[PDB]
Design a protein around this ligand. Sequence first.
Ligand SMILES: [Cl-]
Ligand SMILES: [Cl-]
Ligand SMILES: [Cl-]
Ligand SMILES: [Cl-]
Ligand SMILES: [Zn+2]
Ligand SMILES: [Zn+2]
Ligand SMILES: [Zn+2]
Ligand SMILES: [Zn+2]
Ligand SMILES: [Zn+2]
Ligand SMILES: [Zn+2]
Ligand SMILES: [Zn+2]
Ligand SMILES: [Zn+2]
Ligand SMILES: [Zn+2]
Ligand SMILES: [Zn+2]
Ligand SMILES: [Zn+2]
Lengths: 85, 90, 30, 26
Amino acid sequence: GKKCYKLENEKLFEEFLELCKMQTADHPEVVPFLYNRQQRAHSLFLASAEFCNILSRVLSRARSRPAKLYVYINELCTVLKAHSA
Amino acid sequence: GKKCYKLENEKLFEEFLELCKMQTADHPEVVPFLYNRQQRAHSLFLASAEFCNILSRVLSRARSRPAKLYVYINELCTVLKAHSAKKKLN
Amino acid sequence: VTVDDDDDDNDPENRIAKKMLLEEIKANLS
Amino acid sequence: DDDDDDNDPENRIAKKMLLEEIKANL
Ligand SMILES: [Cl-]
Ligand SMILES: [Cl-]
Ligand SMILES: [Cl-]
Ligand SMILES: [Cl-]
Ligand SMILES: [Zn+2]
Ligand SMILES: [Zn+2]
Ligand SMILES: [Zn+2]
Ligand SMILES: [Zn+2]
Ligand SMILES: [Zn+2]
Ligand SMILES: [Zn+2]
Ligand SMILES: [Zn+2]
Ligand SMILES: [Zn+2]
Ligand SMILES: [Zn+2]
Ligand SMILES: [Zn+2]
Ligand SMILES: [Zn+2]
């Protein structure tokens, strides 16, 4: 059967939110906003391989290029809004 | 990505449970048993077109042939069991 | 021919499915 | 300081856009 990624995606999203908490700390409104976008997304997306791959990619890109972190956050926000319930 | 069916599957599952309430009053344990399997299933399945297809099929078949209700209940039980996320408690 | 308390027996596939399901539920397993 | 967020032009635009989106959803 299909793999349910609900818990793995919660783990990966919390890992990315932690990176954001560390590196956008002069804008403390960013982390709660991204958290709320995640909480409002459709259940299927939140449990999907699609979201898993999105999250592993954004973590990897953020760690390689800190000078582009807001590009990666803004992209993830847009993805989450596009899958909003 | 794929279309999310979380809310539609909740509506359809409730319709099937209501059908079971009408026809299984002599075995009141059936409905809570099916509810427990729904509550223990993986989120992905609960939101899936796969589950929508199964619910649509057993609703239609149970309404067309009520004398085969338990055949269809067993089919639903089996696929919910295949998608279980956690063991039964107490 | 004897009748019993229920109305689930007309279809033999249904009677078997019912017996199996109720035994599963009684066992209180996962 | 060239390590500022606004150094990379794409990052500068993304940051301004995101922070304005957050303000608009207050
Ligand atoms: Cl599957
Ligand atoms: Cl899971
Ligand atoms: Cl939904
Ligand atoms: Cl599934
Ligand atoms: Zn499945
Ligand atoms: Zn700010
Ligand atoms: Zn949904
Ligand atoms: Zn956004
Ligand atoms: Zn998608
Ligand atoms: Zn019984
Ligand atoms: Zn799951
Ligand atoms: Zn059959
Ligand atoms: Zn079963
Ligand atoms: Zn009988
Ligand atoms: Zn009956």
